[PDB]
From Swiss-Prot, chain B:
GO terms for molecular function: structural constituent of ribosome. PANTHER family: 60S RIBOSOMAL PROTEIN L27A, LARGE RIBOSOMAL SUBUNIT PROTEIN UL15. Component of the large ribosomal subunit. Keywords: Cytoplasm, Endoplasmic reticulum, Ribonucleoprotein, Ribosomal protein. This is Large ribosomal subunit protein uL15A. It comes from Entamoeba histolytica (strain ATCC 30459 / HM-1:IMSS / ABRM). The gene is rpl27a-1. The keyword Ubl conjugation does not apply.
Length: 267, 148, 54, 204, 89
RNA sequence: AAAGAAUUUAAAACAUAUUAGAUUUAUCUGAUGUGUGAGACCGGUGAUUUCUAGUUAAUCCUUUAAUAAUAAGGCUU
RNA sequence: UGGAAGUAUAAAUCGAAAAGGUGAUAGUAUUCAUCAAAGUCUAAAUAUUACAGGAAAACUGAUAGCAAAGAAGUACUGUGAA
RNA sequence: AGAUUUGAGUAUCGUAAGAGGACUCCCUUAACUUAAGCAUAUCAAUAAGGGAAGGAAGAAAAAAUAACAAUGAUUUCUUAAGUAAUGGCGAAUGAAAAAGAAAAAGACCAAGUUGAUA
């Protein structure tokens, strides 16, 4: 074997030894520990989006990014100025990539907001926010009542149909096709009526007094992706006759035929 | 283990195992891969006959990520789910649930055709397929999907 | 120089499982230079209640 | 705004009006000491853009430099070198004349800090610059939050280390990306890191 | 079910979401361009361009413009401003 | 001529139109409809791929976002 | 410089803009994608065989270990660097 | 005579110098050596020479990657990798996106507007 060793240069002054590696672990750990002692959510590792990797090699894997786009904060009804102060990363540099990416990170912020508990800026009970929260209790109860009332009627069909399909799969695993067809028809009708409604621009920051349950980060509480189990499908006759090779070669040959089309039209 | 080398079994022998006529001098024909065409040519001819020259076109900035396409043959498809799942659905046909062996989740993109498949229907979800791979999957009673 | 050495983890556990199992043999335990003539059982296990008061 | 017509005007250097003015200025600077102080910048738009502010502690210095290329400083052009290093002419300095001139003002004015410099004019022999200097111990500079960063001790002889814009373009910090692979955070520091032979504590 | 990996229509089915902003000048930069032009005039090479354009040698103007600007596309943008000045007198 | 549901609710570019405030210039800057760009079919429709017969165009590979004509690099002698 | 019809810097000449740069095979054209240069500051994660204060060691044990275990860069040599 | 512009001397209050340079940022066109000779190449941002600082310094907020189900300031570590490429295509030299982590933070000038203007 032909050897290829780049030792002709002075490697003895290029040698780096890792004798400080055991002491690096103690130093970093004593900084994380002493950071929470200052204020525990200081090391909370502010929430980050669920972004895809790049290239077709990794395109199916989700991973944490940095900062939600200003469209994701608006979709989740979060002030972009207040986001940085409640442990949320913000990345104005990130242009939105897809609708499916906007929805997933809008749910990530929505789920995080419900878990988030914001202590008052002033500990004393005479703070404005605590005082104002007692100044709108009667209005909140009236506001809450109608929200539940008018949400209890719009879902009176989807909820019952979803209940029906849930039991249909049970008796099919302890008929089924009717419930799925029936459920899908209801879903289209509901989405049709929504298109045929100005909402709140910003939500309320959840501010309350509570015992200090101190958590070291928020990206571990909200998992990136749901666990994957075995998937199964109904083998119809249409899938049996799908020609994958012909579909791939047609797509390859069509892209390789653009040259002839331009060549022909240019003569 | 310095006590296990040949230096400890050659203490007393004058030449230390290197010969008296031909001493152990500094160099034995150059420093490195010297004389590739002059005096070590018979070495390169014998053991690396295509070491010298050029072949193929230069790729100025090669994108090795665009050539990453892991492949799995048909005979190894059912190992992706398991042997118990294979026997569970061993008596299915058209109309009933058949497990879907999606290979992208397992890191395989192209499905190749080699070996034999169990006589059961199956749904193979993969980015690319081979011409002889699709035949074996369909001859057994299954389907070949596509992804991405 | 190369002070610290590397060993596969599964080979490390193979030796420990072969070293715990070797402590239940009084012939090997005594041969190592241990006075275990008067012990009741060679896998000497003590109550967790007695330990908690030490 | 007045300073938007001046900026558009100053880009027409080949114009007769601007060529006459540069002709007069280059005459005066040839019969003055090489480094000297001027009352106010002669290009107030360019001076203001680079950082000059008409406040106490901000001074302007003019330096005249002899442009063109010099020979390799070897006696009688005799170098005991291999043919690959035997050239005496055609060898160009890595540091731009602007960076070179900025250092001469810095050494001459050791009690101040060099901020930036801009081109003034040139002739067949000389090229003239104008250097913006700041006094770090002025109470106005110290008490201004937006400019007291220059009071940091690491800013002593700023142009000598290569922190001014004129001296940082010669270092290669003109852009980003794959064109500037070797000049990531410093050409020599990047080279040392790439050449490090990491000997891990536990290695095969 | 889950698109295709080859061809023009390739990739996972998804609704892609980018503004094409135009960096340009305002309507007052027209005035600033004229005011400076009167106060300065034309460069030495610009004037030689005007002479060539007057005698109807448009190709020789572009070659001269390329020689002093180093870009085919920037040569056209100068051969248009110069030829526009001829129609403005 | 023969096989063919195709996957499922939070949207930005503006090709265009109609208005609002301005400029005369290689003229712009706002706001509201519309389609685009949309995809949830009801044993039959069918988007979509085969096979046969002509015609038309391209036909050794590459310049790594896509083409073209120059140029250059590949492979064999 | 790995950057190959030029990756970066500098010098001589030349020199823009009703903007424009990049998509590393030079050239023109039409699309597409992605940024918006030529001013400034910015903690944290990283380096350390000056020097000072400590702790360790499968290190050496007075021809060994620093040149130096005592008034060691000392005695002594040279015009001097040493 | 007066209103300005520029340039000086003097007084007062401060500022620079010198030591150290193990680590940091740079200027300079060394050679021995290797190629079994040698002249490009290697040695090699290496030695010597020169400048400047701090407890760290440098860099830092895209005229950046990529061609994807896309990312997203700087720095450092793992990997890509002795790979693409460079080379009397000889000897030899040789990165980077992606991907995994440590730490995380963004702010201003100029230009533009407001002028009983400060």
């Amino acid at each position: 074997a032909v050897s290829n060793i780049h030792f002709c240069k002075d490697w003895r002054s290029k040698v780096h030894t890792w004798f400080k590696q055991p002491f690096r672990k103690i130093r970093r750990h004593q900084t994380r520990v002493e950071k929470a002692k200052a204020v525990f959510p200081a090391t909370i590792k502010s929430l980050k989006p669920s972004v895809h990797c790049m290239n077709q090699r990794f395109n199916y894997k989700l991973r944490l990014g940095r900062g939600f786009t200003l469209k994701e904060l608006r979709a989740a009804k979060i002030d972009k100025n207040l986001a940085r102060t409640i442990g949320i990363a913000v990345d104005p540099r990130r242009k939105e990539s897809s609708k499916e990416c906007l929805n997933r990170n809008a749910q990530r912020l929505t789920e995080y907001m419900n878990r988030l508990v914001v202590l008052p800026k002033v500990h004393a009970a005479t703070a404005k926010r605590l005082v104002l929260n007692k100044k709108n209790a009667e209005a909140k109860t009236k506001k809450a009542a109608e929200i539940k009332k008018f949400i209890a009627e719009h879902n009176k069909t989807i909820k019952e149909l979803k209940i029906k399909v849930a039991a249909a799969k049970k008796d099919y695993a302890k008929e089924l096709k009717a419930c799925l067809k029936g459920l899908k028809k209801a879903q289209v009708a509901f989405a049709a009526q929504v298109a045929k409604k100005k909402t709140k621009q910003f939500n309320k920051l959840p501010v309350q007094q509570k015992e200090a349950k101190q958590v070291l980060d928020a990206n571990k509480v909200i998992r990136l992706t749901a666990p994957c189990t075995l998937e199964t499908k109904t083998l119809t006759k249409g899938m049996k006759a799908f020609d994958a090779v012909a579909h791939l070669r047609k797509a390859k040959n069509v892209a390789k035929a653009v040259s002839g089309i331009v060549k022909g039209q240019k003569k | 283990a310095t006590r296990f080398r040949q230096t400890r079994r050659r203490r007393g022998h004058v030449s230390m195992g290197y010969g008296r006529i031909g001493k152990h001098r500094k160099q034995r024909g150059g420093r490195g891969n010297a004389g590739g065409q002059h005096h070590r040519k018979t070495w390169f001819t014998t053991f690396h006959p295509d070491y010298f020259g050029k072949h193929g076109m230069r790729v100025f900035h090669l994108k090795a990520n665009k050539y990453y396409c892991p492949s799995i043959n048909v005979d190894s498809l059912w190992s992706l789910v398991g042997k118990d799942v294979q026997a569970q659905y061993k008596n299915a046909k058209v109309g009933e649930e058949v497990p879907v062996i999606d290979c992208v989740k397992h890191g395989y993109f192209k499905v190749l055709g080699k070996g034999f498949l169990p006589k059961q229907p199956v749904i193979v979800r993969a980015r690319y397929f081979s011409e002889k791979a699709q035949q074996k999957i369909k001859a057994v009673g299954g389907a070949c999907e596509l992804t991405a | 120089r190369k002070w610290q050495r590397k060993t596969p983890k599964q080979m490390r556990r193979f030796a420990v499982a072969s070293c715990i199992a070797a402590s239940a043999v009084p012939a090997l335990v005594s041969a190592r230079g241990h006075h275990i003539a008067g012990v009741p059982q060679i896998p000497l296990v003590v109550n967790s209640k007695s330990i908690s008061v030490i | 705004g007045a300073y938007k017509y001046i900026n558009a005007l100053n880009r027409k250097k080949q114009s007769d009006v601007l060529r006459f003015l540069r002709r007069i200025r280059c005459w005066e600077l040839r019969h003055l000491p090489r480094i000297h102080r001027v009352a106010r910048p002669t290009n107030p738009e360019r001076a203001r853009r680079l950082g000059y502010k008409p406040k106490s502690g901000f001074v302007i210095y003019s330096v005249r430099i002899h442009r063109g290329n010099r020979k390799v400083s070897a006696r009688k052009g005799i170098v005991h070198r291999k043919p690959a290093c035997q050239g005496i002419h055609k060898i160009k300095r890595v540091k731009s004349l602007q960076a070179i001139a900025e250092q001469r003002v810095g050494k001459h004015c050791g009690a101040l800090r060099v901020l930036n410099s801009y081109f003034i004019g040139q002739d067949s022999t000389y090229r003239f610059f104008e250097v913006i200097l700041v006094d770090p111990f002025n109470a106005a500079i110290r008490n201004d939050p937006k400019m007291n960063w220059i009071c940091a001790d690491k800013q002593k002889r700023r142009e000598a280390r290569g922190l001014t814009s004129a001296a940082k373009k010669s270092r290669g910090f003109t852009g980003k990306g794959r064109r500037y692979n070797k000049i990531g955070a410093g050409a020599r520091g990047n080279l040392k890191r790439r050449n490090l032979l990491q000997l891990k504590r536990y290695r095969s | 079910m889950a698109g295709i990996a080859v061809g023009l229509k390739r990739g996972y089915p998804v609704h892609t979401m980018t503004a094409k902003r135009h960096y340009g000048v305002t309507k007052r930069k027209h005035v600033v361009n004229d005011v400076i032009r009167e106060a300065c005039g034309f460069s030495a090479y610009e004037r030689h361009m005007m002479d060539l354009l007057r005698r109807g040698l448009d190709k020789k103007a572009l070659k001269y413009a390329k020689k002093h600007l180093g870009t085919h596309k920037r040569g056209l943008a100068k051969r248009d401003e110069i030829q526009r000045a001829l129609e403005a007198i």
